[PDB]
Amino acid sequence: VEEIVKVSRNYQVTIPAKVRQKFQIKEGDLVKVTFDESEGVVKIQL
Amino acid sequence: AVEEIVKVSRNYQVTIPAKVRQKFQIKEGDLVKVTFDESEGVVKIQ
Amino acid sequence: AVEEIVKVSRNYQVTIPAKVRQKFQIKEGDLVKVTFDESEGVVKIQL
Amino acid sequence: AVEEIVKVSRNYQVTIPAKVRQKFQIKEGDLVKVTFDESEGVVKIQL
Amino acid sequence: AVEEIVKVSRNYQVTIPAKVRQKFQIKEGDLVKVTFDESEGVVKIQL
Amino acid sequence: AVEEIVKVSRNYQVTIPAKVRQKFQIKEGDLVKVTFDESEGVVKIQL
C-alpha cells in the first residue's frame, strides 16, 4: 500500500485514501511526526 | 528523537514540520512516497 | 563501526540501514553479489 | 564460493538467497547485525 | 554548500556521496576527468 | 596541467590517479572534503 504524492503549500502531505484504509485519520486528529534515522524516512503515528 | 505533534488538516493532510524537514529535506512541490508499514503500524514518508 | 541490528523481513529480506547506505549506495534494481564468507561466518554484499 | 547475484528490492532490502541461507540460517523475525566494513568497502551481515 | 566528509578507500578511491551526486550525476562506468589544481592545491573532478 | 581521465567504479568511487597523487598525496584512511562547486561545475576534493 504505497502512493506518490505532491507536497502542498506549507509542506502539507495528503495521506492517500488507500493508505487511510489502514491509518484512519480525521480532521482534527493529533499525529506524531518523527524522523527515523535508522531508515531515513518520516514516520506518522496515531 | 526529532518528533513533533501535528494536527491533521482538512482533507486528510499532514504538515511535515520545520524541525523534521531539517533532516528530511523536502520542498513545496516535491514528490514523495507515502506507505503504510504493517510491521511498525506507522505511515512512512520516503 | 557504522552498523545496526535489524530484524529480517518476509522472504528473507534484510533492510540496509540508512547510515550504512551513506557509505554503500544502493537503490532498487541494483545488482549485488551476496556471498557467504566461511572464514568470518558473515554474509557479504558487494556492488 | 557460495555467492549469488541479487537485485536490490524496494525500500533498500536485500534478499538472502537459498544457496546462501544453507550456510547462514536466517528467517523472518531473526535479528542480524548489518555493518559497513570500511577496510573492504562491503556490507556485512552477521548473526 | 553541498559538501561531505569521505574517508579514502583502498586503492586510493574516493566515494562521491549521494548528496553530492544530486548535483554531479555519475554512474558506474562513466568517464570523468580528474585534475590537480596546482594553485588551489585541491583535486577537481569534471564530466 | 596534471589531469587524467578515469572510469567511475562501483559504489560511485573515483580513483585518484597516480600522476595526480604525486601532487595530492592521499592514502587509504585519509579524510577528505568532497564538495560540488556550482560556479565551476566540478567536484572538489580537499585535504
Author numbering:
A (entry chain F): 3 to 48
B (entry chain E): 2 to 47
C (entry chain B), D (entry chain A), E (entry chain C), F (entry chain D): 2 to 48
What does the primary publication say about this deposited structure?
We also determined the crystal structure of C-terminally truncated Sso7c4 at a resolution of 1.4 Å to address the potential effect of the flexible C-terminus on DNA binding. In contrast to the wild-type structure, there are three homodimers in one asymmetric unit of the C-terminally truncated Sso7c4 crystal, which is in the P31 space group. The crystal structures of the wild-type and C-terminally truncated proteins are similar, as indicated by the good superposition of their α carbons (the r.m.s.d. value is 0.35 Å for 85 atoms). In the crystal structure of the C-terminal truncation mutant, the R11 side chains of the three molecules in one asymmetric unit are all exposed to solvent and flexible, consistent with the results of previous NMR dynamics studies. The FP results showed that all the C-terminally truncated proteins exhibited lower binding affinity to 8-bp, 10-bp, and 20-bp DNAs than the wild-type protein. In contrast, the C-terminally truncated protein bound to the 10-bp and 20-bp DNAs with similar affinities (~11 μM) but bound to the 8-bp DNA with slightly weaker affinity. At higher protein:DNA ratios (1:0.5 dimer:bp), a considerable number of C-terminally truncated Sso7c4-DNA complexes were observed to form a more open circular shape (67%, n = 109), suggesting that the C-terminally truncated proteins induced DNA stiffening. However, the DNA contour length was not reduced upon C-terminally truncated Sso7c4 binding (1834.97 nm for 5 bp/dimer and 1830.06 nm for 0.5 bp/dimer), implying that both C-termini of Sso7c4 are also involved in bending DNA. The FRET data confirm the EM observation showing that the C-terminally truncated protein forms a rigid filament along DNA. In conclusion, wild-type Sso7c4 induces the formation of a more compact DNA structure primarily through both bridging and bending interactions, whereas C-terminally truncated proteins rigidify and open the DNA molecules at high protein concentrations.
